[model samples]
Target: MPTLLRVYIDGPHGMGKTTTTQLLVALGSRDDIVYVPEPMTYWRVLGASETIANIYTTQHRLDQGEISAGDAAVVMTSAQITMGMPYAVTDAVLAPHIGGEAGSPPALTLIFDRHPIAALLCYPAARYLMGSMTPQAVLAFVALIPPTLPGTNIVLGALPEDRHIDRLAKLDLAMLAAIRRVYGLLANTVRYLQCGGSWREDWGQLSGPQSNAGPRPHIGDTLFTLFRAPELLAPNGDLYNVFAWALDVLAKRLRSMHVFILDYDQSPAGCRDALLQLTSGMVQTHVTTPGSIPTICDLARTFAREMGE
Candidate 1:
């Protein structure tokens, strides 16, 4: 049988791609599959210290087969809902040279956490599309591109739509326009697949209450915590790994609890105490985790909270 690979998981933020990816990793039944993590997180943790030229060189080496394909690569992204800026950067910087294509082509399945509309938009040839497009459509269009085309083969997974898209629509038109272009491009390439709110339903399974209600809670605080202590917990500065750790520890603990309530539920004084306790627990867990040393984790957490807040 051919290797079964999924491209993107479509949906807005908090829609459940992270949860779903975690579940897949845990199950690990497919022998032929690889899970690729998001490139931005890689850049942030590892490449951030390096110049863009270094990043390009490293990416080229990986594309040229200097790096092994490894067991499974899971590429993810947080910018799926905002606009295609993140994807654009990824396509421009890391497009692999699969099959000697003119533009850097991607190798392996992409497993995007969001859509590829932004990647397409960044390319002058693909600018007219919208982000609402489906993954399959994106792949088909890419397939039809000339054999000498430069760029990579991007396989999309599912689409997500959490509160982030609505928020983006209200706040950033440029981003929304870019997303719309992705959707338009998708329409031209493949027949849209309707997978009724599977993304939302999956999130409801974990964060149900808020999944059903008003403005989705901003996870910036949680992200801030992870970002600060990355060195202690993340050897490679892999955002996906950090996020996986968060889900394993925090999400599982608060499973079935409302995020909003978790945010500001108790008395003002009580809430502050609770936040402190939760934050402290998160730090403690990172420090004590088998492979990680906690001092850096603790320091980063303290620093990030102080600075970010």
Candidate 2:
């Protein structure tokens, strides 16, 4: 039997997973591979209720032992954070997709375009700023902080007005400390991904193509130097000009790479297009260059000046 390979790309919203998957699917056709669309896209467009109903019917068919798992499957999903919990609510809703003999799991390949830790950092940032952080917010905040630190609790005390500039400044110093902790975690996650190291290496066999290579830009460098100073990540009006200037400089420096420029406050539609172009180009570029691609070190010295360290 030919070895079956499955790739699952997942991460938080707006991290470019869907765009990357679309590109991969387009490219995979060259290799005769199938591309499965994420179910959520259909759900959001055609009404959530209908989507659930369809999933249940599909799953019921599988649970009846009608559809065999032998059918080649390339299950792609954007909402892996939910881990199928949403569909699992109805007993028959997801049965078809889960059908398989006990102990003989299908060959699977999981591909995450962005690291979970990055999602950990970003989700809270979005929640806090967008007024979505509720009572459950504390749990989310605590999850992002280091277990060894009790300081994060102090930060959690500040409430709904936390994102306000005036209130943000008044926040207990511990809050900033917590932010730093989350930043550290995100940075480590990026480092691990770039090096092809898994968060749980002791349990699962982890590996990546040895020839795969790119500039391993440190999260600190990318965030502080490229993102923060220019206000690329969180631009607030007048800050846009500053960020635009910095982005132009960085883009020129990395001119050899196919870069897609985007505004920090870019609309959802615009962001979607930019991400699709950039990630697709990155994958295609990597295929040809392999190990010849540039490293984060290539731009480290230039970046350090902006970081002021």
Candidate 3:
């Protein structure tokens, strides 16, 4: 294997990605292994938000699939869910855990709790609920990721028909499905775990041209430990070692210039789209200096850093 290694244990809510990873952690080989804890776990031990802690424990729910897509939307929108911590997770999750001390031999493997890609999966739907991002904006953001975001994505797991229902009863189960569909579209490049195998077309649909929702339960329940894991019948489990599979999968992405993003969900669109209205464009006008949200001509530039590195 390569000298540097990074792996993302990603998937939809309640499918058991974390459980599988923890199992691997418990049942370890002689190899050097490190696991990245879920980001908010840190926030919790620090005595962060008493209110927020009450919800992050939404793990181990059952029968969540009983949720209607429409009901999921209603719950998601009304739940006062404005926070997205995954964006804040940023490149830290991978960069922190992967490398070693200069020549101190690298860990053969590194497993992430829930990578930031989960944010991308959840963003479109979350933004829609926020009522600012349009379908076009969502499309543009999706278009930006494949080319802009780095990392070879290998999505795994399945939403056991109705078996996954209400797994996160108080939360939006539909959001989990939405995130899964998003990642599915991103991971068609994966060999056996391709998206669109069996899912409803409108499963995670957010809105029509004319549909509005009411208010939030609170103002901003701003802490996003939001998403879950999965299980498929191990269609093609060719692994000489734990890290080999991840290394092989991330091959192309690892060599790219841009930074890599790794993480999960069932929002993977089941199948891929022909090609939405997305294409590559130069930094027609460089994003100059970054502070607040940059405008159309200012898309957080890397034209400089990309060259030197």
Candidate 4:
């Protein structure tokens, strides 16, 4: 019951970090491997103060004990630093203990979906180079991130030699050019390291056994983000109904009475209908659009009633 191996999924923002991380967790089917989702998935909807408190509480519980052999924790991290900003890392304690600590002989392992370097710092560093970037500017962004890696970052994706990015990703192909060029620059790497920080300089970005591992960094998407954010990938319309199939799998897993829809009308209504058709009796659906500004408070009462709070 001691810690084992820690796997941190590290990749650039537009990359398939989230999708890749979740697939690994869901498919692995190992109860001992706990699931730690990235805060970005929650904070934008929950609000910072509440979100941080929530994370802190869970972290405290885990610190008490979570990863111990048959209990290695598997976390999905993004925006790892400045914790609040986009839900990223080391700059603030998004939770080290990630790939951190070579647990006792067994070495309680923690697998991170993505590392801080992938999101928080990478995006900004790339962004800066596009505008008025300098060694000093790079240094400024570096000052804000973290280097005290809790675990070894197994960076997942990278700017593939030949890739196709969706226009929806709104990525700066030109800027990315600068990011790939300047971000990995020797001058910048040394400055950040001197301050005890991390960089993608020496990081390895493997394409993983081929087969559409999902766009990452210069990559635009995975079919997953394609649904949540839409067309971040190839954009050929609803990505061959990957969502419906996934829901079919989940519904059987939980067998709940109702399905909660957080996505803003993103599902392929007709194809996804099978999920609802299978359900008879009395079932309710709850949809939450937190920032619609026009829809937030309106759902409060219904949510309270549904939750029986």
Residue-level lDDT tens digits of model 3 in 177-244: 55555444333322111221111122122122000112221101111111100111134532222223
Q: Which lDDT tens digits does candidate 2 get at residues 1-309?
A: 112222323322333345445544454333333333344433433223444344334334444666532210101111212323222221122122222122111122122232222223343432232222321332333243222111000001111222323334532343344343444333433343445432223212211201123544443433222133222334342234444443333232222211222221343455445444433323111111222112212222222232212
Model 1 lDDT tens row, 52-130: 3343343344456665322101111112222344444433333222222121111122234443433332221222122
Tell me, what's the RMSD of every candidate? 21.6, 22.2, 18.8, 21.5
Candidate 2, 119: how far from true, in Å? Answer: 7.6
Top candidate when judged by TM-score against the true structure: 3
Higher lDDT: candidate 1 or 3?
3
* Local distance difference test scores for all models: 0.30, 0.29, 0.32, 0.33
Stronger candidate by TM-score (1 vs 3): 3
Give TM-scores for every candidate, taking all chains together and pairing residue i with residue i: 0.28, 0.27, 0.41, 0.39
- Whole-structure CA lDDT of model 1: 0.30
Model 2, residue 151: distance off in Å is 34
Instruction: Supply candidate 3's per-residue lDDT for 126.
Output: 44
* Sort order, TM-score high to low: 3, 4, 1, 2
